Amino acid sequence: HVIRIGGIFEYADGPNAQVMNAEEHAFRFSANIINRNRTLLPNTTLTYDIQRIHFHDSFEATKKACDQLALGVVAIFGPSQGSCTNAVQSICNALEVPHIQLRWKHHPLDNKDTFYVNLYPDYASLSHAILDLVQSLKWRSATVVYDDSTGLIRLQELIMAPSRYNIRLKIRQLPIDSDDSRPLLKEMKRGREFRIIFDCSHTMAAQILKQAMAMGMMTEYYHFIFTTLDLYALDLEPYRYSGVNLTGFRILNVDNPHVSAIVEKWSMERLQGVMMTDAALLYDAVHIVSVCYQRAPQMTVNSLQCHRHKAWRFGGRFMNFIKEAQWEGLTGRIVFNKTSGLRTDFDLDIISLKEDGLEKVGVWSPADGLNI
């Protein structure tokens, strides 16, 4: 028996890209592991259709989503952008095939699509986990530095802190033109802002650290908190002995033996090298959709046509399994809110930079709050 899934990935070169990125590789990686796994889909071969497209091309994303639907798939692991994903989301809702999302995207409440889940930990919860950390460090003031216009929406639960708890916090945006953040850092330095929360990509975080050291802000006077769940992927050796306090989060359950086995195996496969959060969530996504097909009553992949009208009769029940799903993945205990389909409940590691290196100094969940 053969079952098929669809993946759409964004590449700087679109369809012409010749070298495979980590998302797509993680995809192919997890499909292969499930096919060598004797306990999961033992008699079914999990195959895929992979489509490569330019960044920020909704139209192209629509064209490929329809192609895959015509080819027949049980789910579409939609594109990684926020604009491209809100087009495939609508299509998956019309044709009733599950859409799987890996990165935070804005879900307007007044938007009534239900045919999706989202594996990235919800930013409302993340904002709370940051607040519990900050209240625990006793900070009475702090600055929030975010990258793109979207940070304010992601951090709204955090920005509305002054009106609840007693912490005055300033708010600054990294330059849109340049990725030279020195002029900003000069302003924070002059402003004696010593406790800072940086919301931004692991890439941009590496830059900010390098440049904070150039500005003489990598000392015992400073405490940085990073929102990136890929903190453990930064080379922090050049900053290890400076004496800065540096704290962030980790959702990847490294303390678990079979997870470490998978991350090691993953890096052995890489040719460009750790497993970042993007790949780990996709590996978990492909597993949840597989595990769910197995517990779902027998269904078939149907060729659906976007211009046509027919929907997928099995979709509704399948989507329900996925939502109700609860599975232990690389990124720990996985579960979605049943109505929103968002991953608003999860477990975080609180990690902190020591001389000896990054160290797990606690944990957090929405129910138990902080625990150091």
Ligand X SMILES: *[C@@H]1O[C@H](CO)[C@@H](O)[C@H](O)[C@H]1NC(C)=O
Binding site for a second copy (CB under 8 A): 55-60, 62-63, 81-83, 86-87, 89-91, 93-94, 106, 108-113, 143, 148-150, 152-153, 156, 159-160, 162-163, 168, 170-173, 176, 182, 187, 191, 213-216, 218-220, 238-239, 241-244, 306-307
Half-sphere exposure of 194 (CA within 13 A, CB side): 9
**Pick from 62, 260, 337, 365: which binds ligand X (CB under 6 A)?**
337
Check: CB of residue 333 under 8 Å from CB of residue 256: no
Among 17, 20, 33, 41, the residue binding Cl ion under the rule CB under 5 A is 41
DSSP 281-294: HHHHHHHHHHHHHH
DSSP 140-171: SEEEEEESSTTHHHHTHHHHT-TTTSS-EEEE
223 part of the interface to ligand X, by CB under 6 A: yes
Q: Among 16, 39, 43, 339, which residue sits at the site for Cl ion (rule: CB under 5 A)?
A: 43
343 binds ligand X (CB under 6 A): no
Nearest to 362 by CA among 248, 213, 209, 208: 248
Find tokens 């330059």 and name the residue. Answer: 175
Number of residues lying near ligand X (CB under 6 A): 14
Decide which of Cl ion, ligand X, a second copy, none touches 147; Cβ closer than 5 to 8 Å per partner kind. none
Closest to ligand X by CB, 8 vs 322, is 322
- Please identify, using beta-carbon distances, which residue of 65 and 289 lies nearer to Cl ion: 289
Determine the Cα–Cα distance for residues 326 and 335; give it in Å rounded to an integer: 5
Q: Does 234 bind Cl ion (CB under 5 A)?
A: yes
Mark the segment that binds ligand X (CB under 6 A) among 22-30, 31-39, 100-108, 232-240: 31-39
What track of x and - describes contact with ligand X for positions 172 through 201 (by CB under 6 A)? ----------------------xx------
Residue number with CB closer to a second copy (170 or 360): 170
**β strands within the chain, DSSP E:** 2-10, 45-53, 76-77, 99-101, 116-121, 141-146, 168-173, 195-199, 223-226, 245-250, 326-329, 332-335, 342-343, 348-354, 357-365, 369-371
Q: Which residues, 6 or more positions from 59, have their beta carbon under 8 angstroms from its beta carbon?
A: none
Q: How many residues does the chain have?
A: 372
Task: Kindly state the tokens that stand for 329.
Answer: 């993945």
Which partner in ligand X, Cl ion, a second copy, none is near 258 (CB below 5 to 8 A by kind)? ligand X
Residue 105 binds ligand X, judged by CB under 6 A: no
Q: Using CB under 6 A as the criterion, which residues of the chain lie in contact with ligand X when the complex forms?
A: 33, 37, 39-40, 194-195, 221-223, 245, 258, 337, 339-340
